[PDB]
Amino acid sequence: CRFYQHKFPEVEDVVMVNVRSIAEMGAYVSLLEYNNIEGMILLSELSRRRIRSINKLIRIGRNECVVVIRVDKEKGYIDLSKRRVSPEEAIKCEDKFTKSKTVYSILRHVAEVLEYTKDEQLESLFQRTAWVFDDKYKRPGYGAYDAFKHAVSDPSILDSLDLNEDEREVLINNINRRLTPQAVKIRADIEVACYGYEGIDAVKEALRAGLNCSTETMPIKINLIAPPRYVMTTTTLERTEGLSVLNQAMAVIKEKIEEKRGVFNV
Amino acid sequence: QATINIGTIGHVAHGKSTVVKAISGVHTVRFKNELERNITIKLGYANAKIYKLDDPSCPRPECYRSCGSSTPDEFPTDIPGTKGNFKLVRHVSFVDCPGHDILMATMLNGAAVMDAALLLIAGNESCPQPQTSEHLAAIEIMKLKHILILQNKIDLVKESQAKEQYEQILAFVQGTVAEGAPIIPISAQLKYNIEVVCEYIVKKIPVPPRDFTSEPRLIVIRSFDVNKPGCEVDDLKGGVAGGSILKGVLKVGQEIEVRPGIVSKDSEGKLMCKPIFSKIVSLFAEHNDLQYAAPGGLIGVGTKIDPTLCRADRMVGQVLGAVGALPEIFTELEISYFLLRRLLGVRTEGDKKAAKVQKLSKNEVLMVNIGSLSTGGRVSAVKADLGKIVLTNPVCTEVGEKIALSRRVEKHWRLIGWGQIR
RNA sequence: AGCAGAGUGGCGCAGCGGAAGCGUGCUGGGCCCAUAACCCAGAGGUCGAUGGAUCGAAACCAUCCUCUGCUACCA
Known part of the structure; x- marks a missing residue:
C-alpha cells in the first residue's frame, strides 16, 4: 500500500x-x-x-x-x-513517519474489523478522507492527524465525512490515551511574609479567589512544596489561555499578604 | 510540662549520650541526624518524666527492672525500684546544649534561662580541666549555684590520673565556689552508681530562688514547626517557639512583644525600633495537655507565626517582654564591665596562658551579649569600668541585667568577662 | 512534597511511538614472516509492579513502588 x-x-x-x-x-x-x-x-x-x-x-x-x-x-x-x-530533513521525515504511524494504527483496526482479499481496502479509506485534509496542509509535515485530533474534541469531520462503527472507538482510544494527559509545567511564583497575625486567614481568602468570576472557589490546583510557596496550575484541562490567569493571580496574592505587615514588589 | 530546666553541659570529648542515658534513660536528637563519632554538638531537645516508687531509686518507664544500652554485647543495668504502680512526681525538662569549648556563646544563652545544670566533668583528659571551671564561674555570676557535678568515667580513667586531676581542679577553683553542693563521681561507661544520684537529684535540686511574680519576660532559644501539609488545611495554627521563662509568668491568651524590634523604614539614622506583637495561642509541653506554663520551665509557645520562620534553627536568643511594658531604646549605652583574671577558653600545659585579659580600647568592635541577644557595637569612650558603646541595631534595656563579653582570642570567640548594663 | 534518572541484553551513554542503537571492553576469526594499527563475526534475554491503546513498551501514555540525584524538610 x-x-x-x-x-x-x-x-x-x-x-x-x-x-x-x-x-x-x-x-x-x-x-x-x-x-x-x-x-x-x-x-x-x-x-x-x-x-x-x-x-x-x-x-x-x-x-x-x-x-x-x-x-x-x-x-x-x-x-x-x-x-x-x-x-533537518530527517527530522521533517521523522515527523511524517510518526503522524502516519498514529493515523494508520487507528485505520488498521478498521481493516481488521472487515474481511478482505482486496489490497485496495486501505486505499478506499485513504482517498475519501485523507486527501481533503492533507492537500490543504502537509508542507509543515501535517496529515490526517490534525483533522482527527480536532474531530474527537469538537465533531465537525465526522459530520462531513463517513463514520464507521468501529473507527470511532479506536480513534477515541489512541487520541485519549496518548494525548491525554497532555501537558504544561506552569508554576505560580508565590512567597508569603507576615509579621502581623491575620496573614494565615488572609492567604486562604486570596487563594480561593485569585481571579474574579468564581462562585466562591476557583478550580485551581494549589500545591505545597514548602510552606511559603503556593504553586497554582491554573485553568487545568490542557491550558491554552490560562497564562493571564496565572500571571495576574500572583499580583492578587502579593497584595493581600502585604496588608498584614508584608512588604512585596509593586 | 517543665518545672526545672536541667542542662547537660560539658565540654569536648567524654560522651554526652552515654552519661545522659545512664542517669535518665533518655537519648536526645535534632533533625539532620547524624549521631557523630564524638559528643552531641547538635542542639538536642528533650523532656523527661520523673517518678518515685518510694525507693532510693528513680523509675524508668520500665519500673520493675531496667536494662540500659550502650553496647549490645553486655547488658547494662540500672535500678528503677520494685513496682506497685509508679507515681508521677512531676515532668522535668532538659536542655541539651551543643557541646565543645567553642560553642561557649550558645551555652551562655541557654544557661541564662535554665534553672540548674549537671556539669559533666571528664577525667580522661587535662588535669586543670579549663572549661568546667569556665562554666561554673559564669553560672555563679548570673545568680545560680546549685549545680551537681557528675564525673563521667572512672573505669577507663586510672585512680592516679583521676587523683592528680582532683588536685589541679580544686586549686584552680580557688576563686570560684559554685560546687558547694556534692560532687558525685559515677560510671557512665558501665552506667553504674546511679542509685545515690536518684536520692540526690530530687533532694538537692529545686529551682534556685527566682522571682516569678514580677513582669513576664520570655527568652526563645529553640525553633519548632509545625505541622503537616496540606495543602489547604493549611493555613496553620501556627508556629512554636521553644523558650524558657526567667522572670514573671506567661499565662495563656497573653499578647507578647518581641523587643529588639524592627527598625522604621530606611536606615540613615539610628533611632528607632518598634516591637512586633503576637498573641499566645497555646502553652504546649510534652504530649500532655496544658493551658499553663510554669515559670523556670521550657515551654512551647504557639504563636500565629508561619512555619517558614522556624523551619530550622533560626532563633537562638531573642528577648520577649509582655505587654505594654517599656524597655528603653538606647542607641548608645553605658556598660559597666569586668574581666576575668585568667584568659580561659583554651589552655595547655605549656602555660599559655592564664594572664589577665587585655583591656578594651576605643574604636574596636566588641560583642555585647545582652540578654540572650548578641549584638555588635563599637566603643566610643573607654574607661576601665565605664565604656560608652554605640550599637548597630538599637538595644532594649530591660533592666540593669547582665552581659557576657567574649573575645576572638585567635580564631574563634572565647568567654573573657561579664558585667552589667547601666 | 515538587522535580530528575534507572530498575540493561557484558560495561558506559540509555533510540525512537515497529526492540539493545552507538562508543568502549570482552570472546573468536582475518590481514602480515610476526606484533601494533586496521577489517569482520559474536552474546539464551515484555528492560520493578498495577492499568489502557497497541501488531509491541526501559523506550506510546497514565497510576504506583524501590534505590539514588536536585529543591528541601514535614522530622
Missing part, C-alpha cells in the same frame, strides 16, 4: 527507505513513505570522503532518511542519494 497521496514519489523529495539488500552498485532498498517500490542507493553518493568500507554505520534493517536524486518516470528506478542531505 501507499502512505502518501501519490504512488509516485517526486524528484528532490525527502523520503524514507528501509535497507534490505546490498548491491554491487550501492544498495537496493524499498521505500516506506510512499508506495513500496524499489530504489537504488549508490555507493558514490554515500559520503564525500574515504570509505574504507562500512557495514556498521549503514546497515540492513534500519529505516534511514535519504533524498531522491532522480526518478526514471516510466521505468520505476528511484535513484537515491545521501551526498547532499542534512539532519
Whole structure:
C-alpha cells in the first residue's frame, strides 16, 4: 500500500527507505513513505570522503532518511542519494513517519474489523478522507492527524465525512490515551511574609479567589512544596489561555499578604 | 510540662549520650541526624518524666527492672525500684546544649534561662580541666549555684590520673565556689552508681530562688514547626517557639512583644525600633495537655507565626517582654564591665596562658551579649569600668541585667568577662 | 512534597511511538614472516509492579513502588 497521496514519489523529495539488500552498485532498498517500490542507493553518493568500507554505520534493517536524486518516470528506478542531505530533513521525515504511524494504527483496526482479499481496502479509506485534509496542509509535515485530533474534541469531520462503527472507538482510544494527559509545567511564583497575625486567614481568602468570576472557589490546583510557596496550575484541562490567569493571580496574592505587615514588589 | 530546666553541659570529648542515658534513660536528637563519632554538638531537645516508687531509686518507664544500652554485647543495668504502680512526681525538662569549648556563646544563652545544670566533668583528659571551671564561674555570676557535678568515667580513667586531676581542679577553683553542693563521681561507661544520684537529684535540686511574680519576660532559644501539609488545611495554627521563662509568668491568651524590634523604614539614622506583637495561642509541653506554663520551665509557645520562620534553627536568643511594658531604646549605652583574671577558653600545659585579659580600647568592635541577644557595637569612650558603646541595631534595656563579653582570642570567640548594663 | 534518572541484553551513554542503537571492553576469526594499527563475526534475554491503546513498551501514555540525584524538610 501507499502512505502518501501519490504512488509516485517526486524528484528532490525527502523520503524514507528501509535497507534490505546490498548491491554491487550501492544498495537496493524499498521505500516506506510512499508506495513500496524499489530504489537504488549508490555507493558514490554515500559520503564525500574515504570509505574504507562500512557495514556498521549503514546497515540492513534500519529505516534511514535519504533524498531522491532522480526518478526514471516510466521505468520505476528511484535513484537515491545521501551526498547532499542534512539532519533537518530527517527530522521533517521523522515527523511524517510518526503522524502516519498514529493515523494508520487507528485505520488498521478498521481493516481488521472487515474481511478482505482486496489490497485496495486501505486505499478506499485513504482517498475519501485523507486527501481533503492533507492537500490543504502537509508542507509543515501535517496529515490526517490534525483533522482527527480536532474531530474527537469538537465533531465537525465526522459530520462531513463517513463514520464507521468501529473507527470511532479506536480513534477515541489512541487520541485519549496518548494525548491525554497532555501537558504544561506552569508554576505560580508565590512567597508569603507576615509579621502581623491575620496573614494565615488572609492567604486562604486570596487563594480561593485569585481571579474574579468564581462562585466562591476557583478550580485551581494549589500545591505545597514548602510552606511559603503556593504553586497554582491554573485553568487545568490542557491550558491554552490560562497564562493571564496565572500571571495576574500572583499580583492578587502579593497584595493581600502585604496588608498584614508584608512588604512585596509593586 | 517543665518545672526545672536541667542542662547537660560539658565540654569536648567524654560522651554526652552515654552519661545522659545512664542517669535518665533518655537519648536526645535534632533533625539532620547524624549521631557523630564524638559528643552531641547538635542542639538536642528533650523532656523527661520523673517518678518515685518510694525507693532510693528513680523509675524508668520500665519500673520493675531496667536494662540500659550502650553496647549490645553486655547488658547494662540500672535500678528503677520494685513496682506497685509508679507515681508521677512531676515532668522535668532538659536542655541539651551543643557541646565543645567553642560553642561557649550558645551555652551562655541557654544557661541564662535554665534553672540548674549537671556539669559533666571528664577525667580522661587535662588535669586543670579549663572549661568546667569556665562554666561554673559564669553560672555563679548570673545568680545560680546549685549545680551537681557528675564525673563521667572512672573505669577507663586510672585512680592516679583521676587523683592528680582532683588536685589541679580544686586549686584552680580557688576563686570560684559554685560546687558547694556534692560532687558525685559515677560510671557512665558501665552506667553504674546511679542509685545515690536518684536520692540526690530530687533532694538537692529545686529551682534556685527566682522571682516569678514580677513582669513576664520570655527568652526563645529553640525553633519548632509545625505541622503537616496540606495543602489547604493549611493555613496553620501556627508556629512554636521553644523558650524558657526567667522572670514573671506567661499565662495563656497573653499578647507578647518581641523587643529588639524592627527598625522604621530606611536606615540613615539610628533611632528607632518598634516591637512586633503576637498573641499566645497555646502553652504546649510534652504530649500532655496544658493551658499553663510554669515559670523556670521550657515551654512551647504557639504563636500565629508561619512555619517558614522556624523551619530550622533560626532563633537562638531573642528577648520577649509582655505587654505594654517599656524597655528603653538606647542607641548608645553605658556598660559597666569586668574581666576575668585568667584568659580561659583554651589552655595547655605549656602555660599559655592564664594572664589577665587585655583591656578594651576605643574604636574596636566588641560583642555585647545582652540578654540572650548578641549584638555588635563599637566603643566610643573607654574607661576601665565605664565604656560608652554605640550599637548597630538599637538595644532594649530591660533592666540593669547582665552581659557576657567574649573575645576572638585567635580564631574563634572565647568567654573573657561579664558585667552589667547601666 | 515538587522535580530528575534507572530498575540493561557484558560495561558506559540509555533510540525512537515497529526492540539493545552507538562508543568502549570482552570472546573468536582475518590481514602480515610476526606484533601494533586496521577489517569482520559474536552474546539464551515484555528492560520493578498495577492499568489502557497497541501488531509491541526501559523506550506510546497514565497510576504506583524501590534505590539514588536536585529543591528541601514535614522530622
